[PDB]
Amino acid sequence: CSYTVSRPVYSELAFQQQRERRLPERRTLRDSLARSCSCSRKRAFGVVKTLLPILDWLPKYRVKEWLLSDIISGVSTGLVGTLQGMAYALLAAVPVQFGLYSAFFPILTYFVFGTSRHISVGPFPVVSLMVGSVVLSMAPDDHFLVPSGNGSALNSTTLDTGTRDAARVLLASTLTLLVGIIQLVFGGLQIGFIVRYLADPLVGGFTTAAAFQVLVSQLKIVLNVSTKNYNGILSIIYTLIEIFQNIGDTNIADFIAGLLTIIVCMAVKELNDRFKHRIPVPIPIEVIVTIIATAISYGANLEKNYNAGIVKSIPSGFLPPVLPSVGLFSDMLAASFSIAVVAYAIAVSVGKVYATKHDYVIDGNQEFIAFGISNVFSGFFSCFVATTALSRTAVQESTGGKTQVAGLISAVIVMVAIVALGRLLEPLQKSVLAAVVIANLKGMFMQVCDVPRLWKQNKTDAVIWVFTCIMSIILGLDLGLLAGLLFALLTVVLRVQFPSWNGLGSVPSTDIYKSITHYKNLEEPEGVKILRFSSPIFYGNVDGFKKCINSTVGFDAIRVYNKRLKALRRIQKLIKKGPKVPIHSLVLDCGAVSFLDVVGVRSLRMIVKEFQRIDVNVYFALLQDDVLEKMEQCGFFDDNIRKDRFFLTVHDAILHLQNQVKSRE
Amino acid sequence: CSYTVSRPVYSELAFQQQRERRLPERRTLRDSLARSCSCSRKRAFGVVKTLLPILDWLPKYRVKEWLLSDIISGVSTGLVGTLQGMAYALLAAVPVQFGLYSAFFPILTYFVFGTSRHISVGPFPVVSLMVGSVVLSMAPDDHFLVPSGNGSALNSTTLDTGTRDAARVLLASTLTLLVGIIQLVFGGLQIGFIVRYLADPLVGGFTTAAAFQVLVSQLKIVLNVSTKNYNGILSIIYTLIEIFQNIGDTNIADFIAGLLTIIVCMAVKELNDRFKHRIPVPIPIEVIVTIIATAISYGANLEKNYNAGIVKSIPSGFLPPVLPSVGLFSDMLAASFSIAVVAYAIAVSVGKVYATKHDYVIDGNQEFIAFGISNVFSGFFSCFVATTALSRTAVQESTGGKTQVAGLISAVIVMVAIVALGRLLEPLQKSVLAAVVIANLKGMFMQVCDVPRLWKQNKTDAVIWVFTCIMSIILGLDLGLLAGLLFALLTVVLRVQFPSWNGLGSVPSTDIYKSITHYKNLEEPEGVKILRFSSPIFYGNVDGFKKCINSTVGFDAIRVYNKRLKALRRIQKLIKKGPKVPIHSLVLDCGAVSFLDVVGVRSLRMIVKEFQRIDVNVYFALLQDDVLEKMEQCGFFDDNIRKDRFFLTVHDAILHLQNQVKSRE
Question: Residue limits of the STAS domain (chains A, B)?
């Protein structure tokens, strides 16, 4: 209704005297360290409950229908998971059985330490691509070939399959151990704010570039062209040119099979997405298409007739645990860091989505610990990095998923696919597995249609998307993440270095002050000029603040004094011989400041001293208490600049100025 | 006096309707580019006035008394300049005759393009150290030695003086051209805000730690010990160990000579600063110490008797211009960048000190062009990077200096120091010139006494000082600047990622709201909780903003909704069989926000939606106009979240709630 107040004009001290402050909390380092370490059993119960979340949902089961739902969803997601694992095994330059291994052990590990319920832990295209890239970097093909075979002219230095793939698997296991150690370090130290720097446009551009690189790699695999695995700067462009110049060295059968399975998978996926209300359970297009491919590839001997590319290297068994070859972490520190960061980011995103969808929440540090333990356990059994694929976890949620027991049931499908079945997948074409990932790339390729939407929004975030996407294509993929985080931090610094200062004026017959560049009928006090400066002053925006003041007052506080001293000598010589007209006061409406960066309070005091020489009083309007407490310690309230110069509100300063000019002419 | 107002409670729209905005300025890309390029003759006279500042002070000279002081000061700083010029040449691993060139040619260029009047352009101890750091790297001593001399057992691969130091000059000259071009790029592209990132604690800790490297490097010349010029990580630490283990390989004559001039020059320096009011012109202690040292070294043949280290390599002449050996700029990109920044930083810092004292100002972008052309012109005559020494410019100012003509007169003293005199400095000991620089290091060594002062002030700035000082000691000196700029910018991101949120409450019988953790007798509205959050929300502090609200309301907006639906099933089953108590509204006092980072504004719409399900209204208090315009474009004002939810002031949000609960029970 009515907004009426009547209080005296408390500037800084008329309000500080009769208002008693609170006693600050004493440090008591000994007492603080003693009070932190609790001795009661309740804290132990709480930490053992939050560290092993299985003790919460397991005793509270609802077996009646949850058992059947988890059984069917686990069968479905286990088929999908073993398919995705045997497909992504090619992305890591490792044999196919290690994909089935990586689809089994992380699921078992994410059962007693996991805190989610709709997450299918396993392989991931981006993470597998990064692992394969670093494996090719630290173990190329030209470093294992042995000259043997009695060639035509020189030594027959053909391919040396065998110990080569073993070395690749060992390198991948060491990388996964390092990633798990880094994740466990991040979880134990409770540092979870390191992943907050991955903005949505940053991760979007990163996923787009990773999808482009995955498409290039899978096109290389489908076309069956021998590439020199170029890595470094412009590696994707180099390998694309190398593929385009070696098109003649392809396989027609593999090409047409890949095209057919691509179009079939895409059509069935879009049909299922369109007519979702017709059938609740999505049809496993990948399972039926790979079964049909294996069937048509077993009848006709495509390996001998058309010389197609099949696996024919599935051992169909388990492997004893192998100790990781520690000692190569020096050349994999940054790679493991980037891999762990992107894996945790994508996993937390998927978990938060499927948790807000199903009305629950997940913890960050617990997810970090669970993923670290899963990667450590997978590193001991020759597996690659484990994450959650949005396409794989979508099947488990659509078929109906209540808890991770469906994941444990999915591990039985991978179990039977390791021990007994799996030799039936011998004649399966490698181009078929290399195509289902491309069919799954449709989700990340559609993110390019969101760049025009971000441009209509804050343009600073739209540049981060394009910058991260382009930079993660030129200078590889692992350096693209570091080039995006630093660019995002630089953009944040630029938004606080070049603020949006205004010409704050008065509204008639009221007390609220609005900008003069946004409203027409606003008048300012006679002689007084109000200025608002957001983005609190630090060592970078000090010159910007000086320029803003000089532009809002019309002149320069230094040049006016220079002209005054130049004109004073003309008068000082006549005794022996024979600009700042409108500006009366400056009310700085520093209400959007948080810190002051004492290097900046020095410039503030310098401004106050300079404007005092030209008879221009500089006042303050909305300084917070946390800033005044810093200014008191930084040596600002001397015998000249007292607290009366500061004010509580913007209208109080104008009222004080009016009363002063009315009572003191 | 009295502060009384009476206005209706305009929330967002009751003030937007009857207040007409202003028409935004049209882009007019065709007209904006045409309006920028001026065609009037006054614009051409303006750009030529600032580019050549000599056309301002030279026609307006005051030869009546200015020319007299320039002559006495020019000879004063000229004798001190030719000494520091030849002494700092040892820091650049260049011969001593090329140091005199760096004190003559840059002065001629800083006469028609310079914008200062109390700056003595020439060598610098810190800058010459960075130049000599890259000369030893790309041209070490172990890369020019030739096996010749018929040694005892192996080939006599002794020192190869001659083409060795001759190649060092060409390498040093190419560096200055690249440094000069980079300074012209910043001046040409008008980008001058790149040097604003060098805070005072950053440049303070850098020059302090650089003084340690100068002390260790010059101690090598004083003790006359052969060092293996270790560079890279822990370079200063490694070279300090080699000197201490090779103390026996010293020169007693060079030791007692350097230790004597250290205590002599330092004592007279502090004695002159103490009794400053006794004599206006400071006595040239550095000039009287080198003439006496040369006299005693000329009488007694210290070169032959005591095997002392003398120069004996002064050609005493000029050299034709040499074209820069272009092609090594690839290995000097990071090297020239670090030198070009510290050259401009120290120049403007020293220039601004003597500018405010003598009542004048210097241009920022002009110093880039001024020092840019000087470094390019000096690169064509075999010189190193030119800057201004605080010790050298103090002599020119104390003796009385009005303009750069005193510097031009000093160039005549350097002129005669090349053509006629200079051979008299043949028996001058190298330890004497290596000690006059150490005596001047007292100014930067005293900066360590400012670390405790910064600790009582903002502690974030005190950590940047110690970090830059330590990091510029471990990983060399050029990487220390980059490691400090990134750490300083990272500290700004940390201060805006973890803000200082409070518990804003109401003051009795008034309208001002203060924090609850800073005042004792403050009451809050019944049910309403006010929260203030500085450091505007972006992709990093979005999770912290969630935890901030959850900490001030007592619960979590998601966990309460999880418990509600967990409890509603108990009620929904009884029909077929047979927390958020205090929180009424939330007023977010977002008055310290500048940008929104739409990535983060998605959470603001989520927060309003989350608390809406638990019957908790989330309002806003002090949202600025520049911020609300971002929400309109980013898709925030939908059919549910209207503008009435926002308010103009904090008290209007409370008045709207109090009037609502009374009229609507």
Answer: 518-657
Whose structure tokens read 């007023």?
A: B587
> Which residues have C-beta within 8 Å of that of residue A82, sequence separation ≥ 6?
A100, A103, A413, A414, A417
Q: Is B511 on the interface with A (CB under 8 A)?
A: yes
DSSP string, A66-79: HHHHHHHHHHHHHH
Q: How far is CA B382 from CA B366, B421, B493, in A?
A: 24, 20, 44
How far apart, in whole angstroms, are the C-alpha atoms of residue B439 and residue A80? 76
Residue type, A56: D
Q: Residue B502 has which token pair?
A: 């409070």
- Residue A503 contacts B, CB cutoff 8 Å: no
State how far the Cα of A644 lies from the Cα of A662, in Å rounded to an integer: 18
d(CA B592, CA A81): 49
- How far apart CA A537 and CA A596 sit, in angstroms, is 6
CB contact under 8 A, B534 and A4: no
Which chain A residues are within 8 Å of B357, Cβ to Cβ? none
Give the CA distances from residue B619 to residues B499, B664, B665, in Å, rounded to whole numbers and listed in that order.
20, 18, 19
Intra-chain end-to-end CA distance of chain B, in Å? 39
Instruction: Say which DSSP state B644 is in.
Output: G
Q: How many CB atoms lie within 10 A of CB B73?
A: 25
Task: Name residue, tokens 């920044």.
Answer: B341
Residues followed by a break in chain B (C to N exceeding 2.5 Å) are: 578
CB B534 within 8 A of CB B500: yes
CA–CA gap between residue A559 and residue A585 (Å, rounded) = 18
The letter for the amino acid at A43 is R
* Continuous segment of H or E residues that includes residue A588: strand A585-589
Reduced to 3 states (helix: H, G, I; strand: E, B; else coil), residue B446 is helix
Strand A585-589 vs strand A528-532: parallel, antiparallel, or unpaired? parallel
Token digits of residue A231: 């890595």
CA distances to A103, A319, A324, A606 from A169, in Å: 15, 12, 10, 65
Which tokens sit at B216?
A: 């260790």
For residue B632, the distance in angstroms to the closest alpha carbon of chain A comes to: 9
CA angle at residue B385 from B384 to B388, to 5 degrees?
A: 125
Note whether A490 contacts B495, CB cutoff 8 Å: no
DSSP H/E element including B90: none
**The length of chain B, given as a count of residues:** 665
Yes or no: say if A652 and A10 are a contact pair by the CB < 8 Å rule: yes
CA proximity to A220, closest of A200, A242, A201: A242
Tokens representing A401 are 């998923």
Q: How was this structure determined?
A: cryo-EM
Show the CA angle centred on residue A294, arms to residues A288 and A296, nearest 5°. Answer: 100
Interface list for A 43-102 with B (CB within 8 A): none
CB < 8 Å & 24+ apart, contacts of A564-571: A564/A614, A565/B359
- Are B361 and A19 within 8 A, CB to CB? no
Structure tokens at A619: 């006042």
**Amino acid making up residue B25:** E
Please say whether the beta carbons of A543 and B365 come within 8 A. no
The DSSP secondary-structure symbol of B26 reads P
Q: Which two tokens stand for residue B514?
A: 């203060």
For residues B314 and B419, the answer to whether their CB atoms sit within 8 Å is: no
Q: How far is A274 from A388, CA to CA, in rounded Å?
A: 25
Tell me how close the Cα of A278 comes to any Cα of chain B, in angstroms.
Answer: 28
Chain B positions touching A624 (Cβ under 8 A) are 534, 592
Q: How far is CA A298 from CA A224, A310, A605, in A?
A: 20, 11, 85
Residues A367, A115 contacting (CB under 8 angstroms): yes
Which contiguous run of DSSP H or E holds residue B172?
A: helix B163-188
Say which amino acid occupies A53.
P
List of E strands, B350-483: 387-388
Q: Check if the beta carbon of residue A579 is closer than 8 Å to that of residue A560.
A: yes
Q: Is A4 on the interface with B (CB under 8 A)?
A: yes
